[PDB]
Each structure stands twice: as structure tokens, then as C-alpha cells.
DNA sequence: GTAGACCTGGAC
DNA sequence: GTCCAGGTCTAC
């Protein structure tokens, strides 16, 4: 889940939990709990607190309780769902928050990569993992200038740059490949080689892509669904991600896949230079 | 930068 | 069996 997916989950989850008071927190895979490290402290501190809100920062969900904020990262397979505490759990459910009304928030994560951090609301933003995150793409804080500042200072690929949550928060493998395609820039070239024109163009495609993806409820390419278990539809608007071997939508040249910054990378060798 | 981690299930 | 994954983190 990247920004669009996490945002869609946020919108569809919030009304299902706002106003509910945590009665118990059960953890079946402690490793998911990063702070406090002692999972029993993590569980105990939240009991009695009420969910007042649900925000998003980058790819992180931010549950606003009374005193604390629960920072949750879905990683590759983390998913949430709300259901009756009287029904048997689904497979790979590693954390469950039980509310006083009998309903519960269930966190499922097949690969167990997701993480959870709990801090007082005031400390959450000045501690990891939120501390060093870059600006929000759909906000004025993210501009061509900010991209240039970081671009014209490193030799690494422009793709590694865009995947760096400290540069800008929210872009992942899918949206980085789509933005570079739409901006007509090869993923493997040095971020420092990008001209002011390309940077301005990339920034514009980044904002447009992430914005459109949000509207379409995110991209369901493998296992992503919103809190209602519903799939997004932006996958129908992908130009290159997962389309290796298929003809480019703009020029018909077969889309190609390689490895860039240690990750599957999709691009059109004609459209992107 | 870039394998190796961390983990599990799904295509071929 | 072998490869792959909407994500970082880390060790050579
Ligand atoms: Zn093309």
C-alpha cells in the first residue's frame, strides 16, 4: 500500500471505528509491535482509550486516541477490517483491537512485515518512523524546488530518489514507475542528470498520478482492497507497472521490465528517455 | 548502490 | 521447485 491505498483505507475505516472505546488488545505476532517494544505495555496503555480520529502521513496510518497516537505501517500485505468479536478470525490476523460495543478492529498481514508504534500524540511526529518523512505530495510543501533540491545533490537513480520517503512521502514501486513514464524519464538515470524542465514535469506527473489514484480508490494489482474488502480501480489506468511484454499505451512499443534500486522496474524504452 | 533480511502464499 | 511481491532496513 502506497499513499492512495493507505488513504482509501483511511477514509473507509474511520467511520467504522470513530467513537469506539478500546476494551482489549490481543497480539498474536509480537514482532509487529515496535514501540513500546514490550507488547504487553503496548496493549495495556491503549485499553480505555477512545478512537477520536484517523489520519495519514505518507504511507502510515495515524490512529488518534485520547492520549496516544497509534502509528501503523501496512508494508506489503497489512490490511484492516472491522467485524464482530463473536466471529472466528480470518487467517493471518496478528493483532486485534476489541471495542466495548462488541465489535473489533482486525489487522491481517500474511508476510508479517507491518509495524505498529504508539506514542503520546505530541511525540509521534518527532520520533520514528514519522520523524524524517518528506512532505506530502498533494500539499504545497511538495514542489519542483523540493525535488530539485534533493535531485541535484545525488548520483543515484531518479527512481531510488522517488522511493525515498525522506524526499517525498507516499510513492512506491507502482507510482514511481507510472510517474516517470508519464514524465517521459527513464527510471535508471541519475537524478542529478535531470534538467529543470524534466524535474518540473516529473513533479507535475507525480502530483497528478497520486491524485488520480486516490480518486480511483488505489490500485489492486495483487492483494489490495479497501476496508470494505473492495478493490480499487486505478490498475486499469496503469501505463507501465505490471505491463511488461504488453504494448505501450502511447506508442505501442512493448513495455519492459528490469531491476533498478533492487526492485522490479517497468518502463517504455521509447517514451522514456 | 545492492544482496540479504523478514515471511508467506501464488503463478509457472 | 524457482521466482515474485503496493516496503524498508542493513551489512559487504
Ligand atoms: Zn511508449
As a whole number of Å, the CA-based R_g of chain A is: 20
Report yes or no: A64 and A78 within 8 Å, Cβ to Cβ. no
Alpha-carbon gap, residue A16 to A3, rounded angstroms: 20
The residue annotated as part of the active site, out of A20, A56, A57, A59, is A59
Angstrom distance, A120 CA to C2 C1': 46
Give residues with Cβ within 8 angstroms of A132, minimum separation 6: A165, A166
Q: What residue numbers bound the domain in which A161 lies?
A: 133-273
In terms of domains, do A9 and A124 share one?
yes
In terms of domains, do A67 and A199 share one?
no
In terms of domains, do A108 and A149 share one?
no
CB neighbour burial string for A37-67, b if at least 16 within 10 angstroms, e if fewer: eebeebbebbeebebeebebbbbbbbbbbee
In terms of domains, do A113 and A204 share one?
no
The 3-state DSSP class for residue A103 equals strand
CB atoms within 10 A of CB A88: 5
Query: Which bases of strand C sit closer than 7 A to a protein CB?
Result: 4-9
| Experimental method of this PDB entry | X-ray
In terms of domains, do A224 and A113 share one?
no
Final residue in a domain of this structure, among A132, A148, A176:
A132
Alpha-carbon gap, residue A84 to A179, rounded angstroms: 40
Alpha-carbon gap, residue A273 to A267, rounded angstroms: 10
Final residue in a domain of this structure, among A89, A109, A132:
A132
Report yes or no: A156 and A246 within 8 Å, Cβ to Cβ. no
Q: Is A144 among the catalytic positions?
A: no
Q: Which nucleotide has the least CA–C1' distance to A157?
A: B1
DSSP structure string for A21-46: BEEEEEES-GGGEEESSSHHHHHHHH
CATH number, residue A101: 3.20.190.10
In terms of domains, do A260 and A207 share one?
yes
Q: A256-260 and A53-57 as β-strands: parallel, antiparallel, unpaired?
A: unpaired
The 3-state DSSP class for residue A240 equals coil
Place of cell 505501517: A73
Q: Is A263 among the catalytic positions?
A: yes
The 3-state DSSP class for residue A209 equals helix
Alpha-carbon gap, residue A165 to A132, rounded angstroms: 8
Torsion sign across C-alpha atoms A65, A117, A129, A7: negative
Alpha-carbon gap, residue A56 to A142, rounded angstroms: 16
Q: A79-84 and A33-35 as β-strands: parallel, antiparallel, unpaired?
A: unpaired
CATH number, residue A187: 1.10.8.50
Q: State the resolution, in angstroms.
A: 2.3
Strands in chain A per DSSP E: 22-27, 33-35, 53-57, 60-64, 68-73, 79-84, 93-99, 103-108, 115-120, 256-260, 263-267
A140 touches strand C (CB under 7 A): no
Q: Which residue is nearest to nucleotide B9 (CA to C1')?
A: A110
Report yes or no: A249 and A239 within 8 Å, Cβ to Cβ. yes
Amino acid at each position: 500500500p502506497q499513499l492512495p491505498e493507505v488513504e482509501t483505507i483511511r477514509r473507509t475505516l474511520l467511520p467504522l471505528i470513530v467513537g469506539k472505546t478500546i476494551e482489549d488488545v490481543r497480539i498474536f505476532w509480537p514482532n509487529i509491535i515496535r514501540h513500546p517494544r514490550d507488547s504487553e505495555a503496548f496493549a495495556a496503555r491503549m485499553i480505555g482509550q477512545t478512537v477520536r480520529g484517523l489520519e495519514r502521513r505518507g504511507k502510515f496510518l495515524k490512529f488518534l486516541l485520547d492520549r496516544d497516537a497509534l502509528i501503523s505501517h501496512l508494508r506489503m500485505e497489512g490490511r484492516y477490517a472491522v467485524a464482530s468479536a463473536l466471529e472466528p478470525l480470518e487467517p493471518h490476523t496478528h493483532v486485534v483491537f476489541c471495542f466495548t460495543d462488541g465489535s473489533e478492529l482486525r489487522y491481517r498481514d500474511v508476510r508479517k512485515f507491518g509495524t505498529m508504534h504508539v506514542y503520546a500524540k505530541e511525540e509521534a511526529d518527532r520520533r520514528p518512523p514519522l520523524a524524517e518523512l518528506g512532505p506530502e505530495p498533494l500539499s504545497p510543501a511538495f514542489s519542483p524546488a523540493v525535488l530539485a533540491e534533493r535531485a541535484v545533490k545525488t548520483k543515484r537513480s531518479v527512481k531510488a530518489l522517488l522511493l525515498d520517503q525522506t524526499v517525498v512521502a507516499g510513492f512506491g514501486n507502482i507510482y514511481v514507475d507510472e510517474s516517470l513514464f508519464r514524465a517521459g524519464i527513464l527510471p535508471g538515470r541519475p537524478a542529478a542528470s535531470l534538467s529543470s524542465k524534466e524535474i518540473e514535469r516529473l513533479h507535475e506527473e507525480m502530483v497528478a498520478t497520486i491524485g488520480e489514484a486516490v480518486m480511483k480508490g488505489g490500485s489492486t494489482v495483487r492483494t489490495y482492497v479497501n476496508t470494505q474488502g473492495e478493490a480499487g480501480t486505478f490498475q486499469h489506468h496503469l501505463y507501465v507497472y505490471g505491463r511488461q511484454g504488453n504494448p505501450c499505451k502511447r506508442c505501442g512499443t512493448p513495455i519492459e521490465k528490469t531491476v533498478v534500486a533492487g526492485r522490479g522496474t517497468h518502463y517504455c524504452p521509447r517514451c522514456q528517455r
